[PDB]
Design a binder for this molecule. Structure first.
Ligand SMILES: [Zn+2]
Ligand SMILES: [Zn+2]
Ligand SMILES: [Zn+2]
Ligand SMILES: [Zn+2]
Lengths: 443, 443
């Protein structure tokens, strides 16, 4: 627990610590093997995003019971590479960074599972499966999106969702040109035990070559023995997931809907408009599973494997709402991820041999600024849990989409090998940290 | 060493880690008492600020030999309080934050060494002195500024620099009105062994009351046994500092000048103006000591105390140049601080009982964004050590001063009791962390 201990107005009332941590931290240092690993990613969830969410939902002296509860903490770098020069591109996006932590190799913006020479490298999920471990891959984004795709697809551009776009934009990857295929096709080949998110639309496409040509990717998946689920009840009803009967969850056409509604931030929004209170999204159908609900079934099913499992969970629409300059959406999805993180930590503490890691792919735009702020970008004032006004600014783009930022950001871990995120690290160190904790070996 | 291990374009080339860190971290953890403490403060040095400076000066896969070399890392919160309501004010400035880590109590923006009720609370420096330890207070800002002042003065507004402004803005603190006096006057009463910085301008004021009425504050310091120095040569000539002969260095009228020159960022600066390469500041002559030079002498002098010392070092102009939207100024002062930190770490490793801490009072405005970025605020393109462009954006103020931000930010530490910065903590925990490490007590 790291909430403020009492009266924040009085001596010692805002302390998050009750005593000395040296002994407690020594007991958090284990070098034994990790049987399991859970990696939780908030896209765009930099330190600013975390703090804003905490201030709003739990108050400034509050405490995220998931996100803030991991004891070993550091800052890590996530610069991408310029494809032509091989020099740092200081502001990454999902693909290059997901490639980075999943392969241990830097690459260029747009690349999935390939280096700057367009050459494939194996992913941590692929290596876990080879060693006999179960594998899970979960995202509130469409499943073709870069973060979940990176674990199961190798392509020259992240836009190559299905056969149609792959033939056009990844000619070398296309199936009818001898390549491994589209993101969705490769995801089906990768055959993770558990795969849950959105992105049903691309599954409507039919493959133009290969053993299942003329069939929709939906039909292919079924033909190859996958269980299809599309809402929370059916997901819940699933009792097993393995190589004979892998689980595919498709819970929306595109991205899964956000939990909180609020107005878009506006020019002089914190001056011209009144303080905003977030409400639940009334357009989110009740049958859509939450990130934590998806995480529950995943952990339940994957943990059946005696040898162990690897699971990745992505809170995606933190980035998306950050891009859209929508604090309520953005905070809402940070709250959504905290729930999922709680599930993973609850499992991990009971099981005793699980490494849980929580971080983001890169920083983003949202900044917490003073209430009187008069800024050139998009701003909005919110009513927090404290009963006080917080203002948020998005001031790095004139166009309709607010931009990523290149600042280093928090990485936190719990369990075996958690030490390897403390201090300054690079995103690629996370690959090798995970590789080493599971005792995995290159083919 | 946490630099990129090799060729950043190849597998494992961007790794900052050479192996498992568990055994290394176990060694780093000591609960024995700290004999000395060095607290280094980069004013406004958020994780964005650290990253931008590293990217520029050392390249993306580079490594600050001071700043990035502290092994025990975390994230801490620095929200202030609204004076009337006692609820969090989410974006602090230096007075409230410096007051928080120096007293262990939160307070309102503008308050120095007092709580929201205007009650005085003792500072870590005052308590150190009381216990017999030696005390140092070093800054590139004018010494009246909130970060160094917070250790030695208790006033209701940080603007109460000297008698003149105190009578008007802190009438209850004014000396002629029964109070302890202006910041400068209370500083002279506090009588730290070592006090180095700018702010000579205010010492030209005369006191309106008390034992040294009619005399200038400079004359007062002379009469009370202080050694005054005004340049690097004289500073170096000083052989001892103690309560019989305290040292006061005044190296500029106001703030000490910055190392690096570069143009101010502008609207569409990264588009319409060429990439910038920082140069040395021609109007900072070498007779003005650097922060590391001041840190050297301070460490030399204070370390002669058998019982131990407390030293605070502030790189003030990271904040100032961040406000002025000047990447070169801002980055140059971040480099300036890294040197001072190196001096602190070198001493700490040899001595073996010194706790060193590096952090910032709060986050700031500067953001690292993509080169093609088209932002509404002030931007600039810069040529890095990597031979690639990094753009910086300042997008939270339409007036002539870019604003702080509330994001939690990095705290790092080395030595005895350094475990207490790991995980999430509050800026006030830092007070209690330092107090316990030295074993200090209350009256
Ligand atoms: Zn992203
Ligand atoms: Zn994004
Ligand atoms: Zn400051
Ligand atoms: Zn400032």
């Amino acid at each position: 627990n790291r909430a403020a201990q009492g009266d924040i107005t009085a001596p010692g009332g805002a302390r998050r610590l009750t005593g000395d941590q040296t002994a407690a931290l020594r007991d958090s240092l284990s070098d034994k093997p990790a049987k399991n690993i859970i990696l939780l990613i908030g896209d765009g969830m930099g330190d600013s995003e975390i703090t804003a969410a905490r201030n709003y939902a739990e108050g400034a002296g509050g405490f995220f019971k998931g996100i803030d509860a991991l004891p070993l903490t550091g800052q890590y770098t996530h610069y991408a590479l310029n494809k032509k020069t091989g020099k740092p591109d200081y502001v990454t996006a999902s693909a290059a960074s997901a490639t980075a932590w999943s392969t241990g190799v830097k690459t260029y913006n747009g690349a999935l599972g390939v280096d700057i020479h367009e050459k494939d490298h194996p992913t941590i999920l692929e290596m876990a499966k080879a060693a006999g471990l179960a594998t899970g891959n979960v995202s509130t984004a469409e499943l073709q999106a870069a973060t979940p795709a990176a674990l199961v697809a190798h392509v020259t551009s992240r836009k190559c969702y299905g056969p149609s776009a792959t033939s056009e934009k990844c000619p070398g990857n296309a199936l009818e040109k001898g390549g491994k295929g589209s993101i969705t096709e490769q995801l089906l080949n990768a055959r993770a035990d558990v795969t849950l998110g959105g992105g049903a639309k691309t599954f409507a496409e039919t493959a133009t070559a290969g053993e299942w040509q003329g069939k929709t990717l939906r039909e292919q998946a079924q033909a190859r023995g996958y269980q299809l689920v599309s809402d929370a009840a059916s997901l819940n009803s699933v009792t097993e997931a393995n190589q004979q009967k892998p689980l595919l969850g498709l819970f929306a056409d595109g991205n899964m809907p956000v939990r909180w509604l609020g107005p878009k931030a506006t020019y002089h929004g914190n001056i011209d408009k009144p303080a905003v209170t977030c409400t639940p999204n009334p357009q989110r159908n009740d049958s859509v599973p939450t990130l934590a609900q998806m995480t529950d079934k995943a952990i339940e099913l994957l943990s059946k494997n005696e040898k162990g499992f690897f699971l990745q969970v992505e809170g995606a629409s933190i980035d998306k709402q950050d891009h859209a300059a929508n604090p309520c959406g953005q905070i809402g999805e940070t709250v959504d991820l905290d729930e999922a993180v709680q599930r993973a930590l609850e499992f991990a503490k009971k099981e005793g041999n699980t490494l849980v890691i929580v971080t983001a792919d890169h920083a983003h735009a949202s900044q917490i600024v003073a209430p009187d702020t008069k800024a050139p970008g998009l701003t909005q004032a919110l009513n927090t849990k404290d009963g006080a006004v917080m203002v948020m600014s998005y001031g790095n783009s004139e166009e309709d989409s607010q931009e990523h930022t290149g600042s280093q950001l928090r990485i936190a871990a719990y369990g075996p090998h958690a030490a390897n995120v403390v201090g300054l690290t690079d995103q690629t160190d996370l690959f090798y940290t995970m590789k080493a904790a599971l005792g995995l070996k290159s083919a």
